[PDB]
Amino acid sequence: VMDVMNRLILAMDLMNRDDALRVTGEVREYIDTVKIGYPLVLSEGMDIIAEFRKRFGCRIIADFKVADIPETNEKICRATFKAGADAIIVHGFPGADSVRACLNVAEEMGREVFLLTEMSHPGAEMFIQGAADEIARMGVDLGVKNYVGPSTRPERLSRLREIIGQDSFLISPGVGAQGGDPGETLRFADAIIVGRSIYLADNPAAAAAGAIESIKDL
Amino acid sequence: MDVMNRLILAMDLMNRDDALRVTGEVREYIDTVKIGYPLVLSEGMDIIAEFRKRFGCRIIADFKVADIPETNEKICRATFKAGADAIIVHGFPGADSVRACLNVAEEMGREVFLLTEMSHPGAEMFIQGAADEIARMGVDLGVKNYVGPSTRPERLSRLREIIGQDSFLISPGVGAQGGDPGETLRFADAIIVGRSIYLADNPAAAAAGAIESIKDL
Numbered sequence: 001v002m003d004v005m006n007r008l009i010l011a012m013d014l015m016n017r018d019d020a021l022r023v024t025g026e027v028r029e030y031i032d033t034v035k036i037g038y039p040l041v042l043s044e045g046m047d048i049i050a051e052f053r054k055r056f057g058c059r060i061i062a063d064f065k066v067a068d069i070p071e072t073n074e075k076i077c078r079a080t081f082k083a084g085a086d087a088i089i090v091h092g093f094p095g096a097d098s099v100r101a102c103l104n105v106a107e108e109m110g111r112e113v114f115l116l117t118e119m120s121h122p123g124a125e126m127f128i129q130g131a132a133d134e135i136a137r138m139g140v141d142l143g144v145k146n147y148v149g150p151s152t153r154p155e156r157l158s159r160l161r162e163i164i165g166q167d168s169f170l171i172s173p174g175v176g177a178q179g180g181d182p183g184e185t186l187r188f189a190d191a192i193i194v195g196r197s198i199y200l201a202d203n204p205a206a207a208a209a210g211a212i213e214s215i216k217d218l
Numbered sequence: 219m220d221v222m223n224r225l226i227l228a229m230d231l232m233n234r235d236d237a238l239r240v241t242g243e244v245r246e247y248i249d250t251v252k253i254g255y256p257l258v259l260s261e262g263m264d265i266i267a268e269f270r271k272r273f274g275c276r277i278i279a280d281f282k283v284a285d286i287p288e289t290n291e292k293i294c295r296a297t298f299k300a301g302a303d304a305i306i307v308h309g310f311p312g313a314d315s316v317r318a319c320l321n322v323a324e325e326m327g328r329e330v331f332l333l334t335e336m337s338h339p340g341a342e343m344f345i346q347g348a349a350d351e352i353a354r355m356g357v358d359l360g361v362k363n364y365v366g367p368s369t370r371p372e373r374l375s376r377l378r379e380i381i382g383q384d385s386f387l388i389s390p391g392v393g394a395q396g397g398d399p400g401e402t403l404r405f406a407d408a409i410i411v412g413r414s415i416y417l418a419d420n421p422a423a424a425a426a427g428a429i430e431s432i433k434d435l
């Protein structure tokens with residue numbers, strides 16, 4: 001599994017190149033893995049991935065929550081890996097064929113797929129939560145090794161960890177702004193994803209250092 | 219929304235030259251183009267403005283928005299800033315995530331299309347069982363634009379029943395995936411067609427032929 005420095009992944013959702021680059025550079029000594037999503041990509045282009053690689057020594061997880069039909073999913077994965085992303089996050093709710101399409105491209109291109117099971121926001125309780133355990137089981141059956149689970153629901157995150165096993169890699173968002181606790185989340189997740197608590201702080205470096213300090217024993 | 223010939227082109231080619239050329243070859247048959255991530259992630263969001271400059275067509279950003287509310291808001295803002303007239307959002311992530319999109323659309327004068335049931339086989343695993351409820355959620359939220367599967371006419375008909383004749387419904391899965399143009403239009407206001415047109419030997423004839431099959435429709 002990828003060796004995430006300090007078990008902390010930065011969710012870089014700022015929407016302008018200058019600010020995104022500044023903040024990421026300021027926390028560079030604490031984080032070597034950055035999650036780049038559509039807020040930044042749709043604002044600055046896929047070349048932002050290239051710029052991050054050039055400026056920082058950070059792995060890039062493209063958080064695109066791929067959720068289309070198999071044929072389109074394959075195209076999205078190809079374009080994303082072509083740009084330099086180390087991994088891509090895919091939704092499991094659209095079914096097994098859609099996930100398999102992503103896995104096939106990842107295998108062919110030598111990259112990784114992260115399967116998003118349950119989400120962290122309130123709305124996830126409406127439809128996703130009830131399908132989450134089966135989506136996770138589906139991931140295991142398909143050979144998925146990397147997963148995403150919610151920090152906001154410890155009981156659900158714990159169950160997801162059980163389903164995927166200790167060998168699987170699990171990252172978890174919802175820490176900080178959404179209410180999740182760093183340490184508690186790391187009881188089940190290999191790494192925590194943190195966005196606003198760091199990138200909106202007056203001193204992102206201090207925010208990152210503080211978060212790491214609170215989980216130093218972990 | 220008034221879609222010319224009830225036909226929406228799904229432009230999923232991945233290079234600017236081919237995308238612009240093919241769209242230009244069928245421009246006389248359409249006035250609405252669905253642009254998704256295959257093209258956007260390959261050529262950039264500036265491609266939307268380019269399409270409006272060259273064709274003056276309506277642009278539906280098929281981004282199947284499926285994030286938390288906060289992120290959904292940012293995605294919609296960036297998308298509408300690029301010139302998209304509408305955006306497609308997944309309903310599976312819940313009401314709050316859809317509401318976030320509706321708010322931005324209202325603020326920027328755009329439309330939100332709610333994707334209920336999908337057209338591919340995998341949709342039967344989790345989405346289909348929640349589709350009717352997702353559609354009712356759309357009705358409760360005031361959603362007026364929906365997306366349903368051409369590949370399952372009975373499911374598309376049910377979606378139409380739930381949302382009513384007043385709502386706008388577009389449907390993908392026509393052609394390559396097995397859906398029939400005419401049958402799909404019995405329930406949907408417009409059909410979405412990708413490969414059957416942009417992958418055809420002669421895209422113009424494909425589009426012309428498709429419209430011919432639904433001539434008196």
Ligand SMILES: O=C1CC(=O)N([C@@H]2O[C@H](COP(=O)(O)O)[C@@H](O)[C@H]2O)C(=O)N1
Pocket residue numbers: 011013037063116118119120121148149150173174175176177178193194195196197285286289
């Ligand atoms: O269930 C999930 C999945 C996910 O990726 N995310 C993403 O994780 C990040 C959370 O950021 P934040 O720490 O709440 O500011 C954002 O980029 C979200 O889009 C989430 O919050 N919940």
Ligand SMILES: O=C1CC(=O)N([C@@H]2O[C@H](COP(=O)(O)O)[C@@H](O)[C@H]2O)C(=O)N1
Pocket residue numbers: 068069072228230254280333335336337338365366367390391392393394395410411412413414
């Ligand atoms: O359920 C759905 C939703 C959707 O948007 N689509 C999209 O509709 C288009 C269908 O293209 P095609 O006619 O099968 O080539 C693609 O851009 C898909 O991503 C789909 O096929 N099924």
